[PDB]
C-alpha cells in the first residue's frame, strides 16, 4: 500500500561533447542501475521490473530500458519497459513503478532517467521517399526531439524567457540564482555532500590508466555575477536568459531500487526513504515554465499538508527564471531549495534530471538528519509532476 | 475496483508507403482516440490521462503521446507519457492503465498505440561530431530503432525463421497459415465484422475533394497457396520466412477507453468488456518468437484457469509460425485463434498492434456473443505480454 | 590550321525524372561518342583525346569524360580530360579541340557534353567535422553547383528575369517565343528533322523489349499561348519567368568527331562542317543572360563578317527572354534562329547544351542547303561563347 | 611562337584537417594566382584566360576556376574553364594553356590547380528519389570521385601496392624513399629553397591577430627508418604500401603565368623559363602508377633527348613505389629526381599537384644556375603527363 526507496545512485553529469561523451545512455543507465542494486543490496536476478526514462530515443536500438537493465547484469528474464515524458521522464519512471507497486502486481522494481545528449543522431526526414528538388534540412534529434515545441516548433528557452519577463524576473536576479547554483554544487562536491550518491564512471584506456570520473563536470568555482553579467540573451534578443542562468546540454544516468514498504519489513531492510504521494498537472506547452509551484501546491492540497510540513525541496532548474518563480507561487524558503546546487550549474541531461533530483533530494535530506521533502519538475509539453518523500 | 473498457478503436492499417503514407503516427493516434471517446460517450475534457505507445519516435517530436491526445481534441491540462515496449506497446500502455485505475490514483484513462512505419526518417550516427573520412551508413530508423536487436543487430525476421525451424514448423505449414489469415481479413471486411471497430481515416488532397480510406489495405482475396509457395525466404537463403508468411512493415493506430468498474456502474455505464488479469514474461532477444505461448500459460496460471475456459484468442502474427507454435504451447484450438484475420493479412504497425488485437478480440467476441478471450503478444528485446478480458 | 566536323550525334533529351532517369550521365555521354565514331567511319581505337563537358560533376566517379570514352568502346590507351564552364562545357569541349588541332599535336578529337540532372546527389558540408548542434542543410547539388551563382547564391532564373525585365522583354513576348520553340520542336520531330541527329537510347528490361527513347521529351504539341499565360512566376513573384518561358531541368548527351582539315584530305573524308572561328567574352555574373549576343557581334567583328553573312543562328534558349534579347543586340531575323526549337521546348541538360546545340545548327543548315551558322551560348558565373561553321 | 613562364608560385600544403582546413580550394587558388601575377609583374585585368584544374569539385559552386580568379582580383572580363584530369588537372591546365598560346588565340594566360581535400563534403546517392526502405551508404567524396578507380571502386593505393609488387620494389626501398623525400624537403625549407616558391597563406581569426601559413605541414625532420618499418600496410593487409611511403591528403594551390614568347620578347621580360614540349600517354586504370616513366621516355622520342639531357626531374611521389619504379623505366639518376622532397614528405593536394611540381621543378633548376627539368605526373584512370622546360 506504500513503496519504499532501498537506494538510490546517479553517474556525474557531463557536459556535452564532454567527459562522458564516449559513453552510450544506456552505459550511463546501466551504472546508476548496477550501484543503486549493489547499495541496496539486492540480487538483479530479483528485480521483478525495469522502468527508465529517456527522451532522445531516436538511434538508441529496441527498447533502451532493457539495455541499460542488461548493461547493470539485470538477467533477460526480467520485464521492462521505456517512458518519456520529456524533462520529467525519469520521475514518472519512479512514480509509474510507485503505483503498480501499490496494486501489489510486483514488489521489486528498478526506476530512473538517463541521457545521452553529446550522442543524439541528425537525421533526414524527406531520404526515404526523396527530397525530389532543392535544398532541404539535416535535423538536430536534440532540438527536434527534445528541446523545441511539437505544436509550435519554438525553443523550451524561448518559453523560459517569456515566462521569466511575465512573471517580472529581472536579468539580476537570474545571475544572482546561477551564481548560488555554482557555489552550492561546488561547495557539495569539495565538502562530500555528492561523494555518497555519485557512482564514478569508468571509461577503459588503451594509453593505461581508465579516465575514472567522478565529479560534476559544470559547477564552476570561479562563476561571478560580473562574468553573468557580461553573457547575451542566448535564445531571444529581447530576453533575459543566457548561456549562464540556464542549462545547457548534459548527459547522466540515475537509478532508485523500489519495493512495497512490506517486503521491505518481512526481509529485514531498512528504507532510505517512503514515497508518500505524487501528483501531476498540465498546461498549454508554452506555460510548462510556470508548472513546478503549481504541482507542488496540487501535490500539499491532496496531502493536506502545507508549505511548513516540508523540510527540502528540489526543483529541476529549467531556467534560473523557474527557481525563482516556483519559490514565489509555493511561498518556499529559497534557503530550502535545491541546497547541493541544480541544473544551472549541474546540467539537464533530459531524460535522466527528474531521477537525477530524487537522488539529490534524498542524500540532501538524510545530511539534515532526515524528514519530507518534494521534488518537482516541468517538462516540454506544458506538464509538471511532484512526488513527495520522507527520509528515516 | 477492475478496470472496464467503454470502447475500442482502430483506424484501418495501411501499407508501407501506401493508403495513410501522408498521415503522421500522432494523426492516426488522435484520429482513433477521437473515435473511442465518441463510441464511448466521453467529454475529450474529462480523460485524466492518456498512455500511449509508439516505437519509432525518432523525429516524431516531443512527447507524441501529447501530440496524439491534442490531436483528439483533449485539452492541454489532461496528463500524459509515452511508452515503448517495441511490438508490445499499445498492449502495455492498456496494462499499464489497469494497474494506475486500480491504485485509485486516477478513473479514467486512454490507452492505445500508434506508428507511421511510412514516415520514420533516416538517421545519421557520425554527423554531429563529423565522419573525417571514409565511407559510413546512413540508417533507416525503422531497421535500427524496431527492427533489428539493440545487442547482435540480428533482424527480427532472422530469429523467427530460426524458431520457426527449431519448432519443426515447415515452409508448408506456414503458408497454409498466412492463407487462412488473408481468408479470414477478406472474409471478415467483406461480411462486415471490422465496420463497428474501424474508423476511417479522412486525407485532405493538394487537389479536389479527401481520400477517405474505411479497409484495411494489406489483406489480399487473390491470395494462394501456389504464390505463396514459389516466394523466396526473405530475411536468411537457409529460412522458411518470406513476405508472405510474415507481416512487412505498416501504419495504423488503436485506442481504448478505460474506467474503474465503479464509476462505471456510478454513471450508469454499460461496458463494452472487463480486464480480468494480465501479465508479462521475458526470456532472451533470439527467443522472443516464443514468448506467446508461455504469456498464456503463465496468465491461466495466475488466474487458476485452463485452455478451455477461453472463448477467442488474439495472438499477434509477427511470423505465421508464431501463431503454428503458440497454438502447439498453449494447446489452442485454432478455430479460436484470429478469427478475423491476422497480421500476416492485415499487418503489423508495431507501437499500434498491441492495441489494435485487443480491438479486434473485443469486436470478434461481441459477434460471438461475449465470454473470454486473451490477447497475446510477444516484442523485440525478447518479452510477452498477454490479457485476459470478458465481454459481456 | 582548321578544324573539320565529321560526324555530330545527340541523345535525345529527357525530361527531370523522366525518360533517361535510369541512364547515367557517361552513359549518355557514350551513346553519343560511340554514335559519332560509327557516324564518321573512324575506329574508337584512332581517337586521340577526348575532350567532355559536364556541371555536376559531384558523384559521377573520377574523370567523367574517361568513363564516357571506355562506355563508346574507346580504349585505355586515348587520353582524356573533363571540362567545366557550366552551360558552356559541351561546346568549350569543341573550341578547345578546334585549339588543339590548330596546333597540330592531335589531328582527330572526340569533342561533346553530357549531363544527368535527374541523378546528382544531395551533399552535406558539415558531415566530415561534424555539426556540433542545430539544424543544418541537406544541399541539391544541381542547385549548389549548377544553377545558383557561386558569388551572391542567386538562382539564374532570378538573373535571367532581372535582364528580362530591365531589356523591356514582356512575359506575352516570352510565352510567344515560349509556344513557338514547342511548336518549332514539335514539328521538327513529326516532319523528321531529328531523325538524323539523335541517336537512341536502349535501356535494357527485365519484362520484355527494351526501352528504346528516340525522341525528345518535353516539346507538347498542345502548348498555347492562353495555357501559358496562366502559368505563375517561377523564380522570382514580380518576374516574368515561369515553368513554360525558360527550360527546367534535363538529361542528355551530345558529341562530335573533329579532325585536321588536312588528315580528312589524306583520307577522303568529306566532312560535315568547317569550324571557321570562335570567340568568348565575359561579364559579371549576374549580367550573364546578357552574354550571347555580345559573343555574336564579337565574333563577327573577329572574322570580319556581318550578321546578313550568316544563314541559321542557334542562341541556347536559357529563357525565352535570351533568344528575344539576343535577336535585337545582334540584329537577327528570328525566322534563322532555333528553327528546329529550343531549349524552353527541348531543356537544358547543362553540361550537354553547348555541344547540343551545334549539333542541331549542323543538321538545321544541312537541311536548308548548307552555309554559314554560329551557336552561342550564355553561361553561369557570366561568360558567352560563340563557334562560327560552315556546313557544305 | 614557343610559351614561356613569367612567374611560378604555390601556397604551402597543409594536412588533411590541417593548417590550411579553414581556407577554401578557390581562396588557395586565388592566393596562388595574385602571388604570380605580382612576382610576373602582370595586372590581373591583362590576364586573356585562367585555366584552373581541380578534382572534387563537387559542393566548390559554379564553375570554380572562376571563383579562384575573382579571389585573385581578376576582373569579370576574363574568360575561365575548370579542367579534371584528377592528378594531373594542374598540369593539365599548364599544358593547355601552351597548345591555346601557339595557336595565338590568347598570348598571356594563368593556368594552375587548387585542392581543399579537408573541404571535400559527404554524398547521399539516394536521397534525391528516396531510399525507400534499408541502410544505406554516405560517401566520402574525396573517396567516391578522387581516390577509387571509376570502373572497379578500388582505391588508388591498391593499385600503387599491386604495381610495386610487380615492380619488385621491397618495402625496404620504399620506406628509404620515404625518408629521402621527408630529409630533402625539411633541409629545403631549413636552406630557404622553398621561400621563393611559397606564397603564405593568412587567415583571419574569431578572435585576435590571423594566423600566418608559410611552411609546408607535412615533413617531418624527426622521420626515422625505424618508424616507416613498424607501420602497418594501410590499403591492403598483403602489401607494401603504408601511410608513411605514400602521401595522405592535402590542400594547397599552385598557379603560374604563361606568355607567349613573342609578346615577352616585345614587353623586354626576361622568363623565368620556356615551355619546350609536352606529352601524354593513357594506360588501363589499374595501371596508372607506371605510367610517369613512359610518360619521360615518349617525351624524349618526341624531342629527339636522351634521359642525360635534362638536368633535373620533378615525379609526382604517388607512392614512393613510383619514384623508385619511374627511375628505373627512365634511367633516371635518382640524385636528380624530388631534390627538394616529393610528395611522400610534401602530401598530395590532387587538383593542386601537377601545378605544385612545376613550381618546384623551376626553383630547384634556378637553384642550381638553370637548365632543362621534367615535370611527370600520374593520374587516376590510367594517364600520365610529362612537360618539359627549360630554366634561364
Not at 14 to 30: I, M, N, P, R, Y
Not at 347 to 353: E, K, N
Request: with cysteine; charged share 25%; hydrophobic share 40%.
Amino acid at each position: 500500500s506504500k513503496t519504499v526507496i532501498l537506494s538510490a545512485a546517479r553517474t556525474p553529469v557531463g557536459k556535452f561533447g564532454g567527459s562522458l561523451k564516449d559513453v552510450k545512455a544506456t552505459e550511463l543507465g546501466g551504472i546508476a542501475i548496477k550501484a543503486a542494486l549493489e547499495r541496496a543490496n539486492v540480487a538483479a536476478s530479483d528485480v521483478e521490473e525495469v522502468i527508465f526514462g529517456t527522451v532522445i530515443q531516436g538511434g538508441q536500438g529496441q527498447i533502451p530500458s532493457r539495455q541499460a537493465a542488461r548493461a547493470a547484469g539485470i538477467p533477460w528474464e526480467v520485464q521492462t519497459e521505456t517512458v518519456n515524458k520529456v524533462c520529467a521522464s525519469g520521475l514518472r519512471a519512479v512514480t509509474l513503478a510507485d503505483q503498480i507497486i501499490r496494486t501489489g502486481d510486483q514488489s521489486l522494481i528498478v526506476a530512473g532517467g538517463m541521457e545521452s545528449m553529446s550522442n543524439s543522431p541528425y537525421i533526414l526526414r524527406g531520404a526515404r521517399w526523396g527530397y525530389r528538388m532543392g535544398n532541404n534540412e539535416v535535423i538536430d534529434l536534440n532540438v527536434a526531439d527534445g528541446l523545441t515545441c511539437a505544436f509550435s516548433g519554438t525553443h523550451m528557452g524561448v518559453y523560459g524567457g517569456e515566462v521569466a519577463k511575465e512573471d517580472g524576473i529581472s536579468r539580476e536576479a537570474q545571475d544572482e540564482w546561477a551564481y548560488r547554483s555554482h557555489q552550492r554544487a561546488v561547495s557539495a562536491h569539495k565538502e562530500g555532500r555528492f561523494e555518497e550518491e555519485i557512482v564514478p564512471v569508468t571509461i577503459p584506456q588503451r594509453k593505461g590508466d581508465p579516465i575514472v570520473v567522478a565529479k560534476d563536470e559544470a559547477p564552476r568555482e570561479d562563476t561571478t555575477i560580473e562574468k553573468l553579467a557580461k553573457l547575451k540573451p542566448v535564445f531571444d534578443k529581447t530576453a533575459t536568459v543566457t548561456a549562464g542562468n540556464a542549462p545547457g546540454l548534459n548527459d547522466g544516468g540515475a537509478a532508485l531500487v523500489l519495493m512495497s514498504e512490506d517486503r521491505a519489513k518481512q526481509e529485514g531492510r531498512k528504507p532510505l526513504a517512503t514515497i508518500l504521494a505524487h501528483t501531476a498537472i498540465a498546461v498549454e506547452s508554452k506555460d510548462f515554465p510556470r508548472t513546478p509551484g503549481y504541482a507542488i501546491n496540487a501535490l500539499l492540497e491532496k496531502t493536506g499538508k502545507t508549505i511548513e510540513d516540508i523540510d527540502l525541496f528540489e526543483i529541476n532548474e529549467a531556467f534560473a527564471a523557474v527557481a525563482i518563480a516556483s519559490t514565489e507561487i509555493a511561498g518556499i524558503d529559497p534557503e530550502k531549495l535545491n541546497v547541493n546546487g541544480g541544473a544551472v550549474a549541474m546540467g539537464h541531461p533530459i531524460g535522466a534530471s527528474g531521477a537525477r533530483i530524487i537522488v539529490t533530494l534524498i542524500h540532501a535530506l538524510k545530511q539534515r538528519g532526515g524528514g519530507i521533502g518534494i521534488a518537482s519538475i516541468c517538462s516540454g509539453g506544458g506538464q509538471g509532476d511532484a512526488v513527495m518523500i520522507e527520509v528515516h
